[PDB]
Amino acid sequence: SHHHH
Amino acid sequence: NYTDYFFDEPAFDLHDGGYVPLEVSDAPEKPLNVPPLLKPDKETATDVYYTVTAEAGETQLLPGAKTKTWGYNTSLLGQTIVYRRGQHTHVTLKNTLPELTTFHWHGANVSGPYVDGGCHAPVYPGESKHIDFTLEQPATTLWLHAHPCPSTAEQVWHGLAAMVIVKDDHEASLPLPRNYGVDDIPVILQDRRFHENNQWDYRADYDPDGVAGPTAMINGTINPYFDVTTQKVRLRFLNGANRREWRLHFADDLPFTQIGGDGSLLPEPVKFTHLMLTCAERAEVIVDFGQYHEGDEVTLYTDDVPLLKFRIHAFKPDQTTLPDKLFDVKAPVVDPALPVRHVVMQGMDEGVAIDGKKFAMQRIDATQPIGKAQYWDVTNSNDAPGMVHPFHVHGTQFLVLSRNGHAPYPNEHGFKDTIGVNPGETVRLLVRFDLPGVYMYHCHIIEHEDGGAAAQIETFDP
Ligand SMILES: [Cu+2]
Ligand SMILES: [Cu+2]
Ligand SMILES: [Cu+2]
Ligand SMILES: [Cu+2]
Ligand SMILES: [Cu+2]
Ligand SMILES: [Cu+2]
Ligand SMILES: [Cu+2]
Ligand SMILES: [Cu+2]
Ligand SMILES: [Cu+2]
Ligand SMILES: [Cu+2]
């Protein structure tokens, strides 16, 4: 689900 | 809404003009290289003897041709060197490279400038030097790397870095994974750019603001995996990159506990999901894989880029718990007679400087008496947009008192030799030198060091 920046 | 890291989001490397994104390599997955422990030439309880040889070779990094590389007692990086507190240590330094080099023990409280192995300690091709010393400092992860001035960046790029493990009695008594290569591993974080025939070319990739390539390399491995055979694993993160910052987290935000920083155990364990490391910073963490099962592969990322896969095998349950206190940090009292030292890092690119000046090898910039603790106020004067400058001091382990008058970051309450200073920020350090001589302080973006953003301090007996 989660992605970074 | 919020960044998951402690540093100032606008200052991250990824905002820089010439930023080089990491890209996933198509190279096949392979086992993480774990450097062997360097066998002593001889050891007794009181004395240990090592030979450390800088050498050139070839390493199979990508399919096809082998990459020409340099290492310590191996073709790339180096065998891990174990030192013990209070043990008289003897090292023969041998250079078999075509270039002169230097053997810098980053974080080791040894005398400078010769044993320290900075600018003033050249070892020419074909020659040998003999050093000895006794470490009187807490257990931690240090490292060895080349430090000729200039040319540190290029030599590190060729592959001259190695992990150094310092043992003591206190750390040995803690319930920590300590089976090297099995449940306790180096994670040396680097990046490179491969050119034709899988070769490196520092000069083609040069940038005065910091060299970074798009291919991540972990312990000299491309697309590494690690076979986990225990519930808990200790990772010794070292940022051995020329410039790049690592923003480390697992794919699913698996928590991990930091137990160690640059210079010592942390006073207390600190729980993390996301951890940012600037150049030369070390962080020792325990990961608990107890919620996973045989066949699972759990991947450690920086930003959105996968770095290191953990293949879960069968493991016995581990019921142990960390104590609430790991380590007693005994802060020195500042010498009241001594002023506050102000150090200003200025400029970017070619214009980087400290206190208005570029490095000069003959010149002493500062003095401080040994045995006496002093406040160092260190300012990153870089306007917005700026960058996080990792400030390093040779020959001391310092303590972090405050950041812009506020608390240090949660993982900055132990001893450290390198600290990331945000744009505009003043940090206050407590700095004591135990030994007399000449020591360097500088930014540890290695292109900044080479570009002259360094100064030297003379320590003397009063
Ligand atoms: Cu942004
Ligand atoms: Cu001795
Ligand atoms: Cu000796
Ligand atoms: Cu260093
Ligand atoms: Cu250093
Ligand atoms: Cu995350
Ligand atoms: Cu298995
Ligand atoms: Cu910059
Ligand atoms: Cu240095
Ligand atoms: Cu810098």
Structural domains of chain B in order of their starting residue, each with its CATH number: 13-172 (2.60.40.420), 175-312 (2.60.40.420), 341-460 (2.60.40.420)
Task: Check if the beta carbon of residue B244 is closer than 8 Å to that of residue B212.
Answer: yes
Task: Check if the beta carbon of residue B440 is closer than 8 Å to that of residue B454.
Answer: yes
Among candidate residues B105, B115, B190, B180, the one with its CA nearest the CA of residue B146: B105
Dihedral, B77, B73, B108, B240 alpha carbons, nearest 10: 0
Task: Return the residue of B nearest to A4 by Cα.
Answer: B303
Question: Which of B12, B245, B304, B305 to mutate: most A Cβ within 10 Å?
Answer: B304
What is the strand order of the sheet B418-421 is part of?
A: B366-369, B454-460, B437-443, B389-393, B418-421
Read off φ and ψ for residue B169, nearest 5 degrees: -75, -40
* Method of determination used here: X-ray
Query: Residue B348, CB half-sphere, CA atoms under 13 Å: how many?
Result: 19
Contact B14/A4, CB-based, under 8 Å?
no
In DSSP terms, which residues pair with B288 in a beta bridge?
B232
d(CA B109, CA B263): 10
d(CA B77, CA B79): 7
* Ligand 5 centroid, distance to B442 Cα (angstroms): 9
Amino acid identity of residue B103, one-letter, is F
How far is Cα of residue B345 from the mean position of the Cα atoms in its chain? Answer: 20
d(CA B306, CA B387): 24
Q: How, if at all, do strands B305-312 and B224-228 pair?
A: parallel
Helices (H) and strands (E) in chain B, counts: 4, 32
For B17-127, list the strands marked E by DSSP: 30-31, 42-43, 47-59, 67-72, 77-78, 81-84, 88-95, 104-106
d(CA B260, CA B329): 12
d(CA B284, CA B259): 6
In angstroms, this model's resolution equals 2.3
State whether residue B21 sits within 8 Å of chain A by CB: no
Contact B304/A2, CB-based, under 8 Å?
no
Query: Residues with Cβ < 8 Å from B371, sequence gap 6 or more?
Result: B432, B433, B434, B462
